[PDB]
Structures are given as structure tokens and as C-alpha cells.
């Protein structure tokens, strides 16, 4: 689930952000950092609210209307396989499992 944080920040007295300098900050910025943004305009966080959003049935159609790209992309959990090198099987039965011991296959095969 994605967290969407709604932040309300207070501007200092007599500090009006230029209407053209605010639309320039987001230019060529794909990792919006609240920390840096706040430090540049000397703002202060006062209020805040939260609401999450995950994949739902209406997600695909909402992307079509606004052209949001990334609909045909699904994420699968990364799988970590064991780091132990393969080892030869051990045991009386495991040794005698090749065609050599075909006469002893009644003790080695079809074990519960």
C-alpha cells in the first residue's frame, strides 16, 4: 500500500513564494524531498493528515483516463534461495538408489 501524506506548512510573515519559482522547483525533480523543499522556502509544518491507497479494481481504469503509465506492470516478491552448496545425499537408502542395487530396491523405493 502507498502512503499519501497531506502536509500543511505555514509560511513566515510577509513571505510570498513566487508563482514561477514554485513551479520551477518540481522541474526535473523525480524524488520530491520534503526536508529539502522545506529548508529552501523556510516553511514550517503545522498540520498533517494521512490516507493510503493500494491496487484495486478501479485502478486500471483510472490510469486510462489520465494516461498514467505503468498499468501493465506487476511486482512479485524477490525470492532468496538457500546459499548452501548442493551436497550428496546421505543414508543407507539414499546411497542404494541407483540401478546398481536393483535387488535392494524393495528397501529403498516407495518409502512413506
Amino acid at each position: 500500500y502507498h502512503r499519501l501524506n497531506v502536509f500543511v506548512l505555514e509560511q513566515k510573515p510577509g513571505a510570498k513564494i513566487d508563482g514561477e519559482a514554485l513551479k520551477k522547483h518540481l522541474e526535473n525533480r523525480e524524488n520530491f524531498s520534503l526536508k529539502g523543499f522545506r529548508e529552501k522556502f523556510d516553511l514550517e509544518p503545522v498540520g498533517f493528515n494521512l490516507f493510503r491507497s493500494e491496487w484495486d479494481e478501479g485502478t486500471a481504469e483510472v490510469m486510462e483516463r489520465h494516461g498514467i503509465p505503468g498499468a501493465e506492470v506487476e511486482f512479485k516478491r524477490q525470492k532468496f534461495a538457500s546459499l548452501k552448496p548442493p551436497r550428496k545425499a546421505r543414508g543407507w537408502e539414499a546411497k542404494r538408489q541407483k540401478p546398481k542395487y536393483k535387488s535392494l530396491w524393495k528397501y529403498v523405493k516407495r518409502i512413506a
Partner: protein, 62 residues
């Protein structure tokens, strides 16, 4: 490898058998594990073998 034909051959007196055990004097039963019960007796045999199933001769389109 002809065993029992001198020390220098490398297969001389004992003939690769060791020294006075059961593997030198006689023969050990193959199914024997020293006394410990086998796993097929500790777990049992699983399932059955279908003796009525037909043995088809598989043929593919490739």
C-alpha cells in the same frame, strides 16, 4: 587385479579385506544395517502398484 599374489602387487596378504572382521571371515547380509530398523519399516511402503493400468505407446505430433 589378482588378489593374494604377493606384497608388492599391492593386494597381498589381506587382499583388501582389512584385519579379522566379519567382512574378512564371512559375509554380511546386504539388507543389514547393524540392527537399526530400516526406513521402509520405520515409515512403511507408500501406495500401491496399479496392475490393471494400460501401457500406452506414447506418440507425439512433433
Amino acid at each position: 587385479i589378482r588378489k593374494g599374489r604377493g606384497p608388492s602387487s599391492g593386494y597381498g596378504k589381506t587382499a583388501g579385506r582389512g584385519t579379522k572382521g566379519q567382512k574378512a571371515h564371512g559375509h554380511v547380509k546386504p539388507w543389514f544395517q547393524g540392527g537399526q530398523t530400516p526406513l521402509i519399516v520405520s515409515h512403511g511402503r507408500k501406495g500401491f502398484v496399479n496392475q490393471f493400468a494400460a501401457d500406452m505407446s506414447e506418440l507425439n505430433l512433433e
